[PDB]
3C Protease
Amino acid sequence: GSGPEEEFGMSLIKHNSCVITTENGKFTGLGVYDRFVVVPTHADPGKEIQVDGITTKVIDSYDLYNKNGIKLEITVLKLDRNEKFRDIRRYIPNNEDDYPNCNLALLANQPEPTIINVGDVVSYGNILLSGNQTARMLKYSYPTKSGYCGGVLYKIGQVLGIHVGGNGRDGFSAMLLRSYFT
Ligand SMILES: *[C@@H](O)[C@@H]1CCC(=O)N(C)CCCC[C@H](NC(=O)c2cc(C)on2)C(=O)N[C@@H](Cc2ccc(F)cc2)C(=O)N1
């Protein structure tokens, strides 16, 4: 793609993504609004992180859980930094759904901002991700790689999830829902 789906993704990368460095490596971070960023929980961000290489204090953080206490693999961080992210909450769905023809927007661990077409996405339920129960997964059939974590799953005008894992054949994102941020 070089048309609208790719273009919406590149704009999303430029305005609402960042590279988050923790002790566990580099992750694509999604800026949701103001100083709030999401990252995969397994990034294990501490009291300080790097945001695009800049040491940055985390004012607060919290992990998300489903109704039975199962991790969603999303962590919300509020960052001590001057820059504010453009508010993309209106692009986040209200409800779980399936989505045809999705892309992933990748920044961390890539030589340049990268957009991948992962194809059709389904709401898959709970999985075991490195042995740990994880809820509200979105599944796609694409051979994702180790550096894709935090990558933003999207369609035009829809910010759907963040990449959390895979097995070489299937890829999984944590679902983003508007109520998490509102
Ligand atoms: C990013 O940090 C990384 C992305 C890896 C990836 O996309 N890929 C193909 C590498 C293989 C990783 C092996 C794990 N996969 C699974 O467990 C799995 C389950 C199913 C149904 O399909 N695959 C995996 O993805 N692990 C992630 C780290 C993690 C650790 C603990 C958790 F609770 C959650 C995630 C991972 O390596 N993601």
